[PDB]
Design an enzyme around this catalytic site. Structure first.
Site, PDB file in Angstrom:
ATOM      1  N   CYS A 275      39.741  41.676  37.928  1.00  0.00           N
ATOM      2  CA  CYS A 275      38.548  41.741  37.184  1.00  0.00           C
ATOM      3  C   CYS A 275      38.200  40.436  36.588  1.00  0.00           C
ATOM      4  O   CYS A 275      38.564  40.169  35.248  1.00  0.00           O
ATOM      5  N   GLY A 276      37.162  40.168  37.250  1.00  0.00           N
ATOM      6  CA  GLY A 276      36.488  38.780  36.529  1.00  0.00           C
ATOM      7  C   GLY A 276      37.637  37.515  36.684  1.00  0.00           C
ATOM      8  O   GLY A 276      38.134  37.361  37.668  1.00  0.00           O
ATOM      9  N   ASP A 277      37.359  36.959  35.405  1.00  0.00           N
ATOM     10  CA  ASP A 277      38.455  35.867  35.133  1.00  0.00           C
ATOM     11  C   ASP A 277      39.785  36.278  35.116  1.00  0.00           C
ATOM     12  O   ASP A 277      40.676  35.457  35.038  1.00  0.00           O
ATOM     13  N   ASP A 278      40.264  37.473  35.061  1.00  0.00           N
ATOM     14  CA  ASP A 278      41.633  38.342  34.952  1.00  0.00           C
ATOM     15  C   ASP A 278      41.882  38.809  36.184  1.00  0.00           C
ATOM     16  O   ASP A 278      40.982  39.464  36.932  1.00  0.00           O
TER      17      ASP A 278
END
Lengths: 333, 308, 308, 85
Positions: free
Chosen positions: D16-19
């Protein structure tokens, strides 16, 4: 650490003779079906489907039982070890290899294992097996094959005038990184390893400190077959648990002590530790059915008790009075 | 012309792959020096080559048809032409002699070139007098005949009268694995397919047929010329008098700049300018520039005995 | 031509192995110097060679047929041709004189070459005037006749009229074990088999028949030329005026680079460039280059008495 | 590198995106992949003692319970200061 140390010209004939003796009378073989391989005993399956059949057929044959100990029950292992030590009159040598899978050379890989597999399997399966070997180059059977090759090289160097079949008939028990050999080639084994480009560690058998084999200690192989876990490797590290952090400490300790009871019930300086772990972490541990349904569960002779005690003391170089003091301290904690 | 489209329609191609597993073990192999020190011996190099090819053929799992699949080692004399080996349309591996030097010492056996034939004289073994069949020249596709029984010869007689022939194709590779013996190479072959070819029509891919090399230089009679490629993308030229020992290796660029000079004194001055001081080098350069012809004599030679 | 297949079908080979145990003790033997210091003497070298061959024949367990199995030591004169020794098709061992130098001092007996014959003059013993039968040249297979009774000669007369002959084959090796006496060699032979050969057909293996050597150089009349191989894979040439003492050893490469020069002054300059300062060397080189012919005189010689 | 691309991609974990999440067996090889692409990667081994960090959310005991809380490391040191306009 990959290595490309090709062997000398003379050693090639010895390796070919060893490979042919390994082939024996099993010229033709057939691959196993996927279902049979799955019920036997992804990435492991594709090589296992062929290697398990090859091992079971050739390495477990009548003329290859002299050296291929790898692949038998621990009771069978103990019987074989006792028979071998009785044959050698307590004159045996131990081999300990360091990162054999990380040190076997390309020439060895392509002239021992690949040759053996191609000779064992049917011609119509040559492409698949050669592709699998090529993928491997860039599990268990490889170590046994390397040990057998090194034993054959040592035997050939010791007696160059005898027939290869008779030379190979003297191959002693070998199981992966561990094996047994005659003590008369203790010094010449290092030169053979240097010729192949491998590093070998050898230790003379000493009844005072016992014999090391498969992380197992034979207290008195001359008379009794009683055997225990290796004390040198485990005592210095048994107090620290290397389980993953997600498991509670109690469950990991309980599994460790259950295995120790299953293998080292009557071993001095370990039974007390196991019982104290069972007493302390036992009640505080979770349900045993819960850990039986959990993945990390598998991630772990009374007559000569005196002799086993003395052999363990000799192995650990701890005075008998010191041993008694340690036993008292462990029990009273 | 319409002959091109006619031939293209006349494909008659029958590619065959008889489970000929590629010998990638032989291909892309690091060069190695056989001898521990000093220099190797013809027997030692031959043994090493035999060991290499044998272990390769054992790993691939196939068989071979050794001649005193198809394998041949230092059998240039025993084989009149490579076409006899290629006509079987089977994988062929050779350990031949394709020198990068006009003359000098080959391995441990001195050699020299008289006419277009190699006066090879092994230290241990019979002296060989055979040509070279242009193995390592540019190109990977070769044209060769195909074995046919005399009955098939009679059958094709009416068909070959027009000018039809059955031609096989192959792919090429060599390695030159020994640094101490650069004059020797490890040829590798792979047949591709067979077609029918009209004699009076050209080919797109410029497929060549192995031919005897013409070392002699028409512009410098009595001299032999040759040039090869270097690790550092350098084009070196080897020259020397025919049937004679001396030779020299030089960059083709310097030889080019030298060849067009007018005065031998100017040649010597230019050579001095580049820092070349060895008389054995400058004198030979001048000799080649002036095209000095000398009737080299034939004298008996006393060789060593082989030390196995 | 079909003659090749005809001869191949005409094999008539009868290999024989009369328990001829290989003399590996004689083969692959480290060279040794017989004399403790100074230099040896012909008698000493002969005694050492006799001891070596005798102990070898004793170890192998076989017998011998010594001529003043088959053994001969310094019997080049006593034997008109080696064919008489080879016709028996038995193992033969020789201690002959196959010099690597055109002239000079052989062991302790000076020698020189006039015409194609060796004017050998032993310090102790009769002076010998015999040729050399090309022993150490390239190749291991030799063709020689076979002993046949006059009755068998008559029987073959009709058979030999067409051009049939009975020919024996042998394998060759020599050692050159003495460093102080490199001009001498220890020849070794092994018969292989016998066949029938057509006179007007060639052979694949280029089997040669022992022939008298032609030391004289047609290009340099009055001079004798010769060249041999060196431990370090160097091709050295020995030259000298016929029937005369002087000689010089030089690399064939430098001689080649020198031979094509035009001016003797240029020759001297090039020699100076290579650091050669000995007049005895450069003067002889110039003499050979210019092909100077001199009528050497015949003068009486006063030798030493043998000191046993 | 020897498995089929479809089977390889079928193992892609949650991202999920940066994570994101991945298997721990490629902890060291992830840095080399980032260097090959030219990206900078920060990786931390999962530790039950200090919890698991994901989307600024802390899983107290993901083995048994799904209870989750705001990330304490990021917010506690800055919650006393307000960054409003």
């Amino acid at each position: 650490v990959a290595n490309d140390k090709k062997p000398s010209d003379r050693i090639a004939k010895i390796a070919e003779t060893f490979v042919k003796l390994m082939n024996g009378p099993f010229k033709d073989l057939d691959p196993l079906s996927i279902e049979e391989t799955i019920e036997r005993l992804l990435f492991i399956l594709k090589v296992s489907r062929y290697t398990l059949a090859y091992s079971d057929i050739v390495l477990h044959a009548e003329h290859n039982e002299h050296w291929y100990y790898p692949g038998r029950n621990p009771t069978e292992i103990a019987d074989g070890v006792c028979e071998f030590v009785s044959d050698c009159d307590a004159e045996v040598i131990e081999t300990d290899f360091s990162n054999l899978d990380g040190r076997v050379s390309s020439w060895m890989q392509r002239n021992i294992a690949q040759k053996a597999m191609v000779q064992a399997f049917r011609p119509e399966y040559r492409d698949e097996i050669i592709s699998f070997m090529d993928t491997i180059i860039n599990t268990t059977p490889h170590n046994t094959q390397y040990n057998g090759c090194v034993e054959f090289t040592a035997l050939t160097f010791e007696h160059p005038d005898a027939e290869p079949e008779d030379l190979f008939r003297l191959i002693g028990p070998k199981c992966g990184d561990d094996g047994l050999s005659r003590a008369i080639i203790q010094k010449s084994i290092n030169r053979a390893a240097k010729c192949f480009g491998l590093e070998l560690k050898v230790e003379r058998y000493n009844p005072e400190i016992g014999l090391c084999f498969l992380s197992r200690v034979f207290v008195d192989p001359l008379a009794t077959t009683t055997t225990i876990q290796d004390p040198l490797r485990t005592l210095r590290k048994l107090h620290l648990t290397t389980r993953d952090p997600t498991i509670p400490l109690a469950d990991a300790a309980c599994d460790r002590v259950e295995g120790y009871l299953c293998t080292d019930a009557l071993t001095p300086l370990i039974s007390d530790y196991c019982k104290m772990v069972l007493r302390l972490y036992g009640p505080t541990a979770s349900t045993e059915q819960v850990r039986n349904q959990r993945r990390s569960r598998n991630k772990e002779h009374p007559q000569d008790a005196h002799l086993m005690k003395q052999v363990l003391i000799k192995r650990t170089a701890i005075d008998e009075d010191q041993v008694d003091a340690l036993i008292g301290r462990f029990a009273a904690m | 012309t319409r002959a091109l489209q006619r031939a293209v329609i006349d494909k008659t191609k029958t590619p065959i792959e008889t489970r000929f597993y590629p010998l990638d073990s032989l291909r892309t192999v690091t060069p190695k020096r056989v001898a521990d020190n000093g220099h190797a011996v013809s027997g030692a190099v031959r043994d090493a080559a035999r060991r290499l090819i044998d272990e390769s053929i054992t790993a691939v799992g196939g068989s071979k048809f050794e001649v005193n699949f198809i394998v041949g080692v230092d059998v240039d004399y025993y084989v009149t032409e490579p076409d006899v080996l290629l006509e079987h349309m089977r994988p062929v591996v050779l350990h031949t002699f394709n020198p990068k030097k006009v003359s000098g010492f080959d391995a441990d056996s001195p050699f020299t070139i008289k006419n277009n034939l190699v006066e090879y004289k092994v230290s241990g073994g019979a002296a060989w007098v055979h040509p070279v069949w242009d193995w390592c020249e540019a190109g990977e596709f070769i044209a060769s005949r195909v074995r046919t029984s005399w009955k098939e010869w009679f059958l094709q007689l009416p068909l070959r009268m027009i000018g039809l022939e059955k031609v096989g194709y192959h792919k090429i590779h060599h390695c030159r694995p020994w640094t101490d013996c650069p004059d020797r190479a490890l040829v590798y072959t792979i047949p591709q397919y067979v077609i029918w070819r009209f004699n009076w029509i050209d080919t797109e891919l410029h497929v060549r047929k192995l031919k005897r090399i013409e070392y002699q230089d028409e512009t410098k009679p009595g001299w032999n010329r040759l040039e090869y490629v270097t690790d550092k993308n350098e084009l070196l030229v080897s020259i020397g008098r025919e049937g004679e020992h001396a030779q020299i290796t030089i960059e083709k660029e310097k030889l080019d700049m030298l060849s067009g000079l007018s005065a031998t004194q100017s040649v010597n001055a230019r050579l001095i300018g580049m820092g070349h001081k060895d008389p054995q080098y400058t004198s030979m350069i001048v000799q080649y520039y002036t095209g000095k012809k000398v009737v080299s004599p034939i004298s008996p030679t006393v060789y060593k005995p082989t030390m196995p």
